[PDB]
Each structure stands twice: as C-alpha cells, then as structure tokens.
Amino acid sequence: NLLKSLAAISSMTMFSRILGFIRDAIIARFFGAGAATDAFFVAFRLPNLLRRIFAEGAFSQAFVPILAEYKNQQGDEATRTFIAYVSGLLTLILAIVTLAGILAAPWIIYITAPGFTDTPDKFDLTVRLLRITFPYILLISLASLAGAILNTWNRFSVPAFAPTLLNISMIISVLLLAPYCEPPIIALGWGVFAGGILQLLYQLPYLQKIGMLVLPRISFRNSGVWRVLKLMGPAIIGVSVSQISLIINTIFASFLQSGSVSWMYYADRLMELPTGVLGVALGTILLPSLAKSFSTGDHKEYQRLMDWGLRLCFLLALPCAIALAILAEPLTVSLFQYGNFTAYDAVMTQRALIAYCVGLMGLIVVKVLAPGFYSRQDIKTPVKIAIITLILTQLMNLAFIGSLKHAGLALSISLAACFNALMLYWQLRRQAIFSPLVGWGKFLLKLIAALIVMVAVLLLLLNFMPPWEQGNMLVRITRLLLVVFAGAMSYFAALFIFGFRLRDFSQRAI
C-alpha cells in the first residue's frame, strides 16, 4: 500500500520537519528579513539546493541500484570495497571543489547575486558565508551517502531523523553564539557546519551495525564506480537545466530591495509546511512501482497507479494551497512576526506565499508525472519540457519583476510549474501512454463542493477573530491550530458526506 508508505514517511520525518520550522522561526525572530538573512540564504541555501538537485537527480539514481546489486548478487567484502571507492572518489572531488569555490567565492557571489554589488558590506558578508558553506557540502554529501546505504539495508528511521541534529545545532548557534560573532548571522553559518558533522556522526554506528562502515580509498579501475558513472551520464543535462533556472532566478532576485530573498524563503517554507511529504514521497515510491508495471506488461496496474497518484494530488494539494492562501496572515503573524520580524516583513511574505500557492499544484503534479517517462526509460522528453519551462520562467521573470517584485518572481515560478505539469500530462496523453480512468467528473465535483465548504468555514471563523498581532506566541499558535483543525475537519467531513471513502482510495494504491 503506497498510502501506507506515505503515512510511514510522514511519521518518520515529522520530528525533523517540526524542528526545521522551529529553526526558521528562531532565524526570523533574531535576524528578521533583511541584508544579513539575504546574504545567508544566497550563500548557503542556493549551493545546498544545487547540490541536492545533482544528488537526487543524478548520483542517487545511479548509486542505489548498483549498491543493491552488490548487496544481493555479491558478497559483503566486494560491497565494502565498492563503498570505499565511491566515498573516496566523492571525497576527493568535493575537496577539490571546496578549495576551488573558497578561492573563487567572490566571483561566484558576483554572478549569482549581482545586485548585491551596490552594497559592499552585504557582498562581503555573502562571500564569507559562502566560504563557510563550502565544507558543509562535502560533510552533508558524505552524510547523504551514509543515509542511502542505510536505506538500501531497509533502515529508514535513522536517515529520516538525521536532519534534526542540523536544526538543533543551528538553533543553539543562534541562541548562544550569535551575540559573540561580529556579524551575528556568522554564528548561524557555523551552526550549519557543526550540523553537518553531527549528521554524519549520528549515522556512522548504524553503518557499522550492518558491516558497511569503511575507510575511503581511491581507485580508477573499480567496475562498480564505472557502472555508477555510466548511469550518471545521461542525467547531467536534466540536472544542469534546473540548476541554471535556479541560478537565474537568484540573479533576478538580487536586484530587488533588501529582504526580498528572505521573504521568498519564508513564504516557500510556509508552503512546504503541510505538503513536504507528498512531493518527494509519491515520486520515489511511484517510480519503482511503475517501472515494475511496465516491465511485467501489466498496463492496467500502470494506468491505475498513475491515476491514483493524480487523484491524491487533487485530493490533498488543492485544499492545502487554498487554505495557505486564505490563512497567509495568520500563518505569517503567528509563526514569524516576533523580535526583528516586523509586520512589513509579514505582509511581504504573505504576498510571496499567495504567489507560490498558485504553483504548489503544478509542482506536486510534476513530481508524479515525470516518473511516467522515467519508468519507461525516457529521460529526453522531461528534459525538453524542462528547457521550455526555463525559457517561460525567465520570460515571466523579466515581465513581472518591475511591478510585482519578489511576489512576481514567485508567481513566475508558479505559472512555470503549472505549465510544466500540463506539458508532461499532454505528452503522456499524446503518446497514448496514459489515459485517465472513468469517474473524474464526479471526483472533481465532490472535490469542488468540499473545497467550498472548507473555504466557507475558514472565512467564517476568520471574520470572528481579533487582530492576529495581539496576543503572545501561545495565543496566536493556539488560534491558528484551532482554525486549521476546523477547516481540515470540515473539508474531510464534506468529502465523506459526498461519498469519498478511505478504503476505496487505499485500494487504488495497490
């Protein structure tokens, strides 16, 4: 049951996600949304996101299958040797990249955030934070490799808990080290650094428990390393396209007023809060199922899995996007507006979040529909569609920046994701790969009715409540949780009244 899989993934990631939002709230309270946070987000978050794009789009899809074949077809000694050579090559490459990026950090910041050049102190702070960021890439890459090995041995709780330590270390660095750092946010940077270390050392004993903890070594003649490189080859183009798109979006953001990057960051975090599970969970668990369907010839199961993923997208991401748009002020004020995060920052974050809610659905649908081509050994069509999406994204950025500013950049990304999803779906329909099952009309009608009930309940409750800035954090968060509970319970109650049953949707998972 893939619904069971999504529940398990949610339960395993809950604690880390909660602490990540506590960390974001601490950052907002102590540093607000200004030049220092902009420098931190450009220097740390952008390289981390580029690294994650490369790791999940290229490295893992090549390393995990070869590791599983070593585990199942070869012995533990040959597998340990393969792991040692993999880790050694990764460590050497990332050490070279760390050195080169520390030496070239000013030009890196220059081309990724040109608008920062009119403020020399902000630029220097960004370059300094990037110089601290670069070793974290190597640390967190080794930690990710450990997590992948542990997942291959069916150990998912430990890697899903690992980022808790990063969040805790960042929080402690802000609370205890920021008063002693000359630019205070510098402490946060080191809190990330130590975090990486912790995330590694937390997973090393478990690696030793399964007999897969080995010293790294270098070898340019290992069969497995060449197998992984050959499988990594055809994904570099797809990785580079999304990397370039993110870099140009950052370039556009760098020319806006101080705080725009931070407002966008807080908005996208708020958007990720309820739907962080579905996005990646559905994709990673649907790709192997559809691959097996296509290999066995069971086209009915392929169609049913795809249709179930799409219907779950409609059933869970749509109400979240609508409710996030409606509750933008309650969310921003109850979660962020404390200390140096002012009401102005709250309003700007609300604008960006409302812009992001338009494309939440496009993102969740893209992550489900891309395996429709990936499972059939088709990397070319998603890359073509992604190139077109990049072109449209930059066109809309150029058109929207002067008037809508940061919110306009967010809306550009949202519309681009929407049309990315639509192009993927229309390609699937065109090649006769997928055709939806019967009963989408009644499904959508009941969905619309439940959504109307939810919106009515939300607006009714919001019309009765005092200004959200009055009251301390306890009061605000209690009110927000109560309103969210009422909205969600009304939505699911309407869904049940109109015929939706949990058993019936679980049967479509498998």
Ligand SMILES: CCCCCCCC/C=C/CCCCCCCC(=O)OC[C@H](O)CO
């Ligand atoms: C809006 C300003 C005029 C148009 C700029 C388009 C730049 C396009 C290319 C950027 C990549 C990096 C190349 C180097 C860019 C340096 C830009 C710079 O330093 O701009 C400082 C200025 O004060 C800022 O308003």
Ligand SMILES: CCCCCCCC/C=C/CCCCCCCC(=O)OC[C@H](O)CO
């Ligand atoms: C820079 C300074 C860094 C200082 C770092 C200090 C870290 C202290 C540890 C706290 C434990 C974390 C919270 C534990 C809460 C319960 C954890 C638990 O039981 O988790 C089991 C796990 O899910 C099974 O996989």
Ligand SMILES: CCCCCCCC/C=C/CCCCCCCC(=O)OC[C@H](O)CO
């Ligand atoms: C104020 C609120 C702002 C935020 C709002 C967030 C939600 C927006 C999403 C709407 C769903 C639209 C779905 C349209 C796409 C599905 C139908 C479709 O694609 O139909 C053509 C297809 O070819 C048939 O096979």
Ligand SMILES: CCCCCCCC/C=C/CCCCCCCC(=O)OC[C@H](O)CO
């Ligand atoms: C916000 C828009 C962009 C982001 C989201 C992109 C969604 C892409 C399509 C998803 C599956 C749609 C399946 C539609 C199946 C319709 C089948 C049909 O013929 O339905 C007959 C019924 O009577 C009346 O619809």
Ligand SMILES: CCCCCCCC/C=C/CCCCCCCC(=O)OC[C@H](O)CO
């Ligand atoms: C790996 C690197 C890949 C690089 C790929 C090439 C990037 C070339 C430049 C992009 C557009 C820059 C546009 C800059 C000017 C538009 C923003 C103008 O922004 O004004 C801002 C102002 O604050 C309100 O209007």
Ligand SMILES: CCCCCCCC/C=C/CCCCCCCC(=O)OC[C@H](O)CO
């Ligand atoms: C059907 C859809 C129904 C609605 C779906 C959800 C919509 C968004 C609501 C989220 C509330 C989250 C409340 C808790 C947020 C985390 C707060 C926390 O633990 O830390 C923040 C604090 O400020 C640190 O000091």
Ligand SMILES: CCCCCCCC/C=C\CCCCCCCC(=O)OC[C@H](O)CO
């Ligand atoms: C234009 C200049 C931009 C400069 C700023 C960005 C530089 C760093 C980004 C990527 C390189 C490093 C990529 C490292 C990938 C490691 C993959 C890995 O370890 O993956 C383990 C596991 O498989 C995971 O699931």
Ligand SMILES: CCCCCCCC/C=C\CCCCCCCC(=O)OC[C@H](O)CO
């Ligand atoms: C991980 C990424 C590594 C970099 C990827 C390519 C970036 C190319 C961009 C611009 C030219 C940069 C030329 C840099 C020439 C050396 C500068 C140098 O060594 O400067 C030392 C000085 O002390 C100050 O740190």
